[PDB]
Each structure stands twice: as C-alpha cells, then as structure tokens.
A paper describes a structure:
However, each of the affected individuals has a single copy of the DHSN173S variant. Asn173 is part of the helix flanking the entrance tunnel to the active site. It interacts with the side chain of the neighboring Asn164 and with the Val17 and Lys19 main chains of the ball-and-chain motif. Surprisingly, the melting temperature (Tm) of the DHSN173S variant (64.1 ± 0.6 °C) is comparable with that of the wild-type protein (DHSwt) (62.9 ± 0.1 °C), whereas the Tm-values observed for DHSdel305Y_306I were significantly lower (46.7 ± 0.1 °C). Structural analysis of DHSN173S, therefore, confirms that the mutation does not have a significant impact on overall protein structure but does affect the ball-and-chain motif, and likely also impacts the interaction with [name]. Indeed, we find that the N173S retains overall structural integrity and some enzymatic activity. However, our data also suggest that the N173S substitution influences the stability and/or mobility of the ball-and-chain motif of [name]. This, in turn, may affect the accessibility of the active site to the substrates, namely spermidine and [name].
Author numbering:
A (entry chain A), C (entry chain A): 28 to 80, 82 to 363
B (entry chain B), D (entry chain B): 28 to 363
Amino acid sequence: STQVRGYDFNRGVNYRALLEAFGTTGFQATNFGRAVQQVNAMIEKKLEPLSQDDQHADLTQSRRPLTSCTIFLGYTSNLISSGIRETIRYLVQHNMVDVLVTTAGGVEEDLIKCLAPTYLGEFSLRGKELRENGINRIGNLLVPSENYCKFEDWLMPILDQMVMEQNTEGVKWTPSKMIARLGKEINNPESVYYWAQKNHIPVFSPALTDGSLGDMIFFHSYKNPGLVLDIVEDLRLINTQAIFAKCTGMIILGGGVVKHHIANANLMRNGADYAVYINTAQEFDGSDSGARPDEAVSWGKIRVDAQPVKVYADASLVFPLLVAETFAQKMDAFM
Amino acid sequence: STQVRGYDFNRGVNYRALLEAFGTTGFQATNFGRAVQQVNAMIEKKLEPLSQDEDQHADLTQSRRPLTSCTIFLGYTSNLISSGIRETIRYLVQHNMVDVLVTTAGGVEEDLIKCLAPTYLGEFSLRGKELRENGINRIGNLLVPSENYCKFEDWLMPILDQMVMEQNTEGVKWTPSKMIARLGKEINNPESVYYWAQKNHIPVFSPALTDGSLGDMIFFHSYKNPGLVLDIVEDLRLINTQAIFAKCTGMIILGGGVVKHHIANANLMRNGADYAVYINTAQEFDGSDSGARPDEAVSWGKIRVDAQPVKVYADASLVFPLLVAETFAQKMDAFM
Amino acid sequence: STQVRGYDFNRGVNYRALLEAFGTTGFQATNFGRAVQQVNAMIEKKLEPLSQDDQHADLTQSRRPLTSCTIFLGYTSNLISSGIRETIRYLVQHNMVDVLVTTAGGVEEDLIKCLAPTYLGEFSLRGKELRENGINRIGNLLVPSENYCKFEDWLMPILDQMVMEQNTEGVKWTPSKMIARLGKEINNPESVYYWAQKNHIPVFSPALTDGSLGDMIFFHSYKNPGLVLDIVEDLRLINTQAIFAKCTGMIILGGGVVKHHIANANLMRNGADYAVYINTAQEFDGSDSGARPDEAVSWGKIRVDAQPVKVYADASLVFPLLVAETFAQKMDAFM
Amino acid sequence: STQVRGYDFNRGVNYRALLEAFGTTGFQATNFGRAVQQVNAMIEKKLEPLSQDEDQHADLTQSRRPLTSCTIFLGYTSNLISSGIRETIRYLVQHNMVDVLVTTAGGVEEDLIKCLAPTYLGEFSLRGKELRENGINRIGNLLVPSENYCKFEDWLMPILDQMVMEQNTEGVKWTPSKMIARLGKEINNPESVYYWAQKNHIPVFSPALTDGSLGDMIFFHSYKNPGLVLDIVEDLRLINTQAIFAKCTGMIILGGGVVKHHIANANLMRNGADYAVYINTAQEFDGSDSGARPDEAVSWGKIRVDAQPVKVYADASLVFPLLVAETFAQKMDAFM
C-alpha cells in the first residue's frame, strides 16, 4: 500500500518531480497520475512492432497502416476554441493518435483560427452588450462575428467544388470525407485538420451540421443545391477502425456525442483496452456525459480487465500536463 | 420588490400553493417559478390566433402541421427517454403541445425498445463487471437487459430491408427525421413518443442518429443489404425552416450536448428564440456549450435580447413533471 | 425488480400521485422517492411508544424527553436566507425533530427576518453596484445592509444582559445556550429559534462567531468586555443526545460543518439508523461536503445495516416536497 | 486584446513555458494564470518595505510576528491536510510565506496524526461495510486506519491533562488557536504544519475545532478530568485584529465552508481584502457561500471593489502545487 505524500518544495522546483508527486497527493491529483500511467501503457503498446498485411485496408477501406494499438482521441468543440487546439494539433501532426472524434464546432473553429484569432474575455460578460458589438462568447473566450464572415468567404468556393465533384465525379460525401477536404484546403500547419488528412487520420463528427459549418452549408444549398452528407458510410468506417484493431485506447476530453460515439465503436470489439476520460460532468443526472468509465464496462465498451481512469478536471488545465508526461516524452519514438 | 417567503405547512398540504411558493423561496426554487412563468407565456402565445399577416408568413411552411402563434422546440438527452420522463414527453407530443423534437440516437431507440421490453431501477454504484457477466447494461441508476436489444434487432431488420428497397426502387431520399417518423409508424404503440410524433406531424431531428444501438443495427444490416443513405443536409434545411417561418419560438431544453446546441442554432436563423427554459446540471466553468448560461446564447443571437430566459440547475427527472403539471397540463382542454 | 415508468398526465393532475411516481422515474427522482421512504421510516420509529425514566435527563443534562427516534436536522445558512426557513420553522414549531445543527449565518438570518425581509434578486448582479447601494448578495437573494443595523440595535442590550448574568449569576455561556436566549428574546412565531427554545430543541453551531453575529459580539466586547462562549460543553450536550438515543436519524441539507458535526456525534453510538442528505456537492475533490453516505459508513457514523439516501438537488426545490410527503402527512400524530 | 494560443510541444517540454501558456489557453487554465499573477502581486507587496507611517499602524498589533506590507490568510479544508497538499502548506508555513491559517478541526488533527502514522491511497468506490469491518476509514480516495486515532489518543490525553491543570492553577484561558499552537509545540516534528506555525508565530484559527476526532478525545477526557474551556470569542478578536491593522491583505482559500467564510468575514473589518484567490469545485447555483463567486464577497465589502479576485474551478490537489511552484517557490530566497 502506498502512502500519501506531496511534493516537498524544500527540494526546490523540479517540474518533472512535481508532476510525478501528483500520484501520491490524492484526490484528482492521484487520478492524474493514474492517467499518465494508462496513456503511457497505450503508447508503449502502440510502439510494439507487429506483423500483418492489404487485407486490413480492404475491410477498413483505409490507407492508414495498422499499429499494435489504435488510439481514439475525442474532444468537444470548446477545447478547439481554447489553446488545447495547439495540444491536439501537436499529437495529430506527429501521427500519435489514429482516429479523431469531435463536434461540428470542433471542426470549424480550428479552420477559422487560421483566418482570424479567438480572444480572451470573461464568463461574466453580458450577452446584450456583446451582441451589440458583434462579439460572440464561448466560456471566457470571445470570437468576433466577422470571423464567420471570413469563414463564409473561404468556404463557399469549396462547397461549389464539392457539389460539382459529387454530381459528375461520383463522390459520395460524408462528414469525415468533408473534414479531410477542408483540412487539405486550409493548407496551414497550425490546423488540426490539415495535419489529420496529411497523416491519414480520419475525423468523425456525425452531427457536423450542428454549427456554423451547418449554417454555411444551409445558405450555400439555396445558391447551389445538391450537397448530400451521408452518415451511414462514416459509421462503417469508424466501426471498422475498432473491429480490426489489435488493441484500442480511448482518450476522451469532455462529454456528449464524442464520448458516446467512440465508446460505441469499441463495443464492436467488446471493449477498449485502455481508457482515459477528462471532464467535469457528473453522474447523478444519469447522462452519458457524466457516467464513470465503469458504466461503459457494464456495456462492454471497456473491457472488464481494463483499468480505466477518469480525471474530474477542466481539460484546459490537465491535458497539456498529461501530454507533457506521456506523448511528448516519446517524440523520438514517433520519428 | 419581492420578499423571500416559503410555503407555510401550517396551512396544510395545498399542493398548488406549495408549487406556487417556489417562486419566492429562492435559489433554484425561484428559477423553477420563473420557468413556469416562461413556459406559460409560450403556451399563452401559442394559443393566440394568427392575424392575417401572421398566417400568411407561417403558411410558407410546406409542412402539414397546423401553424400556430408559437412554435415550441422540445429537446432532451437520451437518458431522459430511459427514465420515466419518457412518459412526460410522450404526453406532450400526443396532445400536440410541442412542435419539433430534438434528441440524440439513444433518445429514439430507447423509446421504441420500451414498447418491446421494460427498463428497470438499479443503483449508480453497481459494478460493471458483474453486470456485464449477467448481460445487464447500466444507465445511471437504471438497468436494461441485453435481450432488449435482441428484440430490437428482430423488430428493426425487416424495416431496414424495406427502407433500402424504397430507396432503390421508389426514389426515397432518407434522412434521420424521415427514418424516425417511419420507425414511429412501425412501432404502432400509443406508449411511444415517436408513434405520436409521426401521427401528429411533429418532426424529430437527431443529426447523430447513427451513434448508438440503431447505428449498430444499420451497420450490421449494411453488410447483408448495403447502400442505405441517411442525409443530414436535408434535415438541416427542414429544422431551420421550422424556425425561420415561425411567428414566435420557444425552446424547452432538457440536458446539454447536440440537442441544446442544435435547437439554439436553428433559432439563430430568426435572430433568436422569444422564450427559453433550460433544465440541466451542467456547469459553465469548463466553457462547454452544455454548461453555458442562456446569456451566452444571447451573445450569439440564439436567444433574443428582450427575452427573459431561465435556466433551472436541477436533474430534469425531478423538475420536468412538476413544470408540466403547472403549465401544459393546466391547459389540456385547449389542446384537444 | 421494479420497472421504470413516469407519471401519466392523461390521468390529469393529482399531485400526490405525481410525487409518488418519482420513485419509478429514475435518477434523482428515484432517490427522492427513496428519501420519502427513509424519512417516513424515521417518523414511524419516532412515534413508537417507549418506556424509560430522570436518568436520561441527568446524563444528557436536557429537559427534552426521549422518544423512540432522535432526529438530527442540519442545514446551511443559505437555506435560512431562503424560504426553506419557513419549512424548517414548521418542523421545529411542531416538535417533529429533536436537535438542530446550522452555521452562524443560519442563526442570525432567522432572527433578522423578524426585523426586516430578504428580497429576490439574481445571481448575475455585480458586487460593485450592489455595494454602492448598500445591498448584499446571497445567491439570487438580497439583504439590505440596514438589516444588520436593525439587528445590531436589537442585539446590543441582550449582550449586555448576557455579560451581566455571566459575571454575577454564574451563567457559563455556550453557542446553544446563546441561541436559545436569542430565540426567547426575538419572541416571534415566525422564527425557527423562538420555536426551538420553546420546545426544548437545542441548536448546535460551534462556529457561531463566523458571521454577523460574530461581528456584533466583537464590536460589543470593546464596549462591554467579558463574554465567553465555550464550545466544550456544547460538545458534551450534542454527543449525549446521540449516545442515549434509542434510534437516530439524520436529515442533512447542504455540507460543511453541519454535515460533519451531526455525523460525528452519531459515531459515538457507532452510527445513525436512518440518514438523508440533500445537497449539490460532489465527491471528486475528497471533501466531506461532497462525500456519499457510504463514506460515513466506513467510519461508523451510519450503521452498516442502514439504507441511507443522498438526493443530488438544491434543497430549496426538494425539501418542501419531502416535507409535504412525510412530516406534514403525520401532523395529527404530532398533536 | 490577448489572443488564445496553447503551448506548442514542437518546442519541447519546457515546463515553465508550458505553465505560463495556461494564461492564454482559456477556461480554467486562464484563471490559473490569473491566480499566479494575483498571488505574485501579493508576494511583491509583502516584500515591499513599510514606510514609517505604515510601520506605525501595523505595529499596533500586539502580536510577535514581524509585520509586513501584506498579511496573507491561507485557508483550507480538512481533506487537503489528509492529501499531499499537507506537504505544500507545511512548506509555506515553514518559510513564513503566509501569516494566518484558517482550517476546520479535521485540518488540525490529521496533520498531527500524520506524524504518528501515515495515510494511504485508496479508491472513492471502496464500500463502507467491508472497510468498517477491517477498521479502515475512507476520506475520498484516501484511507486512514482506526489505529491511527488510537495512537492519537495515547499522544493527546497527557496534553489535555496538562492544559486543564494550567487552566485551573495558572489561570490559562484556552482558545482554539492557543490549543493548536500548543499541540504544534508538543508534536515537535518538522513534517507538521502546526509545529511550524507555532514556531513562526503564525496563528491558526478553527472556530469548530471540536467537530472531529480532537473533539471526541476532549469529550472522553472531560469525564475523567472535567472543566476544559475553549473560548471562541477571544479568537474572534485575535483574527479580526490581524486584518484590521494590516497594511494590505491577501486571501488564498482552498475549498469552501467555514474557512472560506471566516477569512472573508475577518477582511470585511478592513472594508475588504486587496488580493484574493479561491480554488474549489463548489458551484454557485444552490446559493451556498462555498460555491459563491468572489464577486459575491465584493457585494459585502469582504473583497475591495478595485481588487481583481480570481476563482479557479479545480480540485486544489492538482492546482495548488503548480500555483506554489510559479509564485512562492520562485522567491524562496527572499523569505529566508
């Protein structure tokens, strides 16, 4: 049995030792330490050599090579509005995860940040005055409305090409296919989705129309009717990523559809081997967002022998620390 | 200037008086009282007749549903359909008291499956290992046997066969809302929310319909019978049109996530809902949309500036039946 | 096994049936139903006749007669600022509970409401403007500063008498003794503490000085030095209420010291027989406020065979409903 | 106008840069950055010298502690003393970096008991029955053997005997803070927070000191040796005087409850703290003082209007060591 003991600042300030001490500090600090261990277990399993074949690509319909552990990373839109956008972009840029799952805000806000920035503000700011000045609030963040005007100008010509390619080149569009195209078009190394499509990391977002991107598509469809986005084919693509995995881990930031969609794909292989949740949602109202990992065990979305971890924390604080002690330590092994 | 005072039980248990007294009790009790006022304002507006000019603009809807002076969007998370709030929602839909539903995938199939097999009471603390071993799945403090989903598979597969056939031979262009209407017709059971929704021409939107057991079944089905397409773009036009050509709109949103965002974003298209009540336990401090106060939506134009929206920070399983008792259920005669 | 089913409004509106249906509705509605049952179990045990003696009074040093179940009711100050003040006053007026535990705000705000009201406001109101207008915010409630001026005028002459009685009539003051005296002085049937002292229900508040009452005592002590408030004797009084109980129940609204103090007194009898918590606090930071009842079982503050219930809810909503279906149904049996 | 940008790990793991980048990351990460700025402002003020006039007013304190330009109140709940944050708090107290402590009863005795026997890591989910049967008590995901309290009984009883004797024969008028100072002297262990507090003349206030294991022991003791009095009125004068004759005040408050309220109410006596940082997970919507935003305290005059207080919505076990690393620990040389 391990004793409780916090970091002793009489040693001075060594950050690596400070973070290691979280494991024995208790409460959510201990769960953070447990999360470092689970993610490092995922990474070490991923780095094990493997031997397998063209077969894989025919049943997944993916160009992505299999590894010894397929890592699903899911995150809510607000985290793409935050600086965790840079954290996620880093992992995708270096091919450290295999599948992304977000909400529609979580696609478009990455793209818009390549056109214009998001600013710091305060939770307290009143909507009346903000609206009168053309500013939209996201938590304690602020996005000028003009940001979406620039987004519209950038996007309309691409939508025109997508409709044309659909009606004459046979393209059957889905959200993931669309997200890849937008990342290719934004063509900017600051963008998560630019790196994802370059590295053949698919992005699933079955509610992609539920945001500003949806708005644009709606307005565009009266100037250029025709665009269809199918969600059934994306279901086959994400589920096959899970079924034909050697091992799977889930890193899930926040709740909602991103949490559920990743968990349900792993129910196809009767469960994920590793799982970390980081969110502030609570169980007591029965919502999937607030459920402990152990609920997902009852369903088989996480294997009974797994040691899943939830850290009850704002991921804006915890996720960069987690990456610092896990993925960022093994950068040499990813090149 | 309104003074704080609680209900005095020296008067006896006068239930209506006790509920009315929440308004002056403070904290979330006062917010409940404000939510009752906001929903009654939605209902009073809804029953007001359309002038000639208003009728002209609302008829632009190519939908069969009679247009009213207030189009009410009801959104709820899947857990509430697993709960007994399924019963509350079904009643409102049965009597045409709301006009548009928004939910998540689980929120469709658990209503249908409850017409095949029940959900049971459990405890939050039950461990996943022993439950999984006995083929019981946990939803909060509720429990659903795996057998339930088998029954659902046997029921749904044939319908999936027919939908593919109608897609391919009759030109049907399926969307989530059209599939949900169809599944409601098939279930053909007056205990079902979606049975009543399709009977009463109340559309159901669920852009992430594939993310659950229904998706599992579509996925398996697609291998013995491929090609089913569910387009989300057409549904986006359909929900947005409900908001654009409304004389007035109200939002009643239970929980967070896509249901909260999708309803509010549809109302951005008319420069804001006139009335809105949120009921949920999510907190704002992580910047989630689920935990945002209504005043954030005001920032965006999703709720009008002159509106007086209300958030009640409570589990809807407690609050929503009380809210309905004090609002819609008092005007039942006006809806039949 | 019980099926989930909510109330069917096709029956019309019968509130008693509506509340009963919470038990089968799920999530916190089910826990509410479980709480109704636990409190009704407490009340039914309390109403069982008993046979015992003067002995009791000598080891508790209390005039309160023993019953078959001693009910401890604890609540945080904010609930005395709310209308739950009326709910609590009703239970105390009719001798339905045996021991009260609150914080200091929870004493003085009951007394002040007999001099001037608390008003409705909003959580959003900014402190700068409120302070400039002499208004203090409590959640979405508002208390003018003048309220505390009236309180000061009312209280100073009583403090003078208490110091005099201490230094010449031997009175050894404690918080509970003081709270009884203040309830006697306010002499107003709207006051919780007026009814508590009339019915010999003791009020424990070991941090009584941590509020406006504390302020006043502080200022008074420079005009009239001498007042001592001992907490050791109040410890003996509350613990003996628990030790010499036939059975005990705890109804605890909110967290903090009120939750802990009641639970620790019941650790003296190796546990309470019935227990209901109503609060919105969460466990994940390890605080006693957010702990589930099952933590208290590990300590022996609740008996292993008990079936304690926590309702995760604002007590301003839930407590009047709970009382309506429990204590208020048995009013005839309390007269 | 400050843009949102996160730390770019393409730069490597530069820990100081990563922590500084929280300020522009958003949500609670930005609040952490603001908390670092507020605490560094407290520290910079504290190290500024007292002018002649300022020295004159602060010396009015009849306390031994050297007065500084900023009196810092550190408050924390009992659970944090059970956690490894005990280690963080002890360091600050050891090096005279704070001036007044406020805690709850558990917050005193668990520090002393850790000098007799350790606390262990557990899980939140461990069931109370099997723990009780094996004489293990649960504190969140931490575990304390019952034996710990037996060791504490054997250690404390003799001291209680002496305090009664000094009360009765030497005229000692005991209060919670005086008892805590005495228990710190007795423990005589440099791992103990209260050892260092009494060594450095840092008073500890705990009006509800009786509400826990220490109270249990006082209670039992009072039967073989009655009469111990702990007066809370004198301690009220003592904490209030620390605030009234301060040149400047800062509050660092971890968690809610009496510690939060008592520190803030002491600062009402000077018409407000100049600096304040709250770290806790409590929510405002039930109207609790624990969950109130700092701006509520502004309403009361507990925090000055011109202050820029900060609440970080996080478990302090995560945040507080990071905060200390970026503030107090960078100025260690100035405090020795």
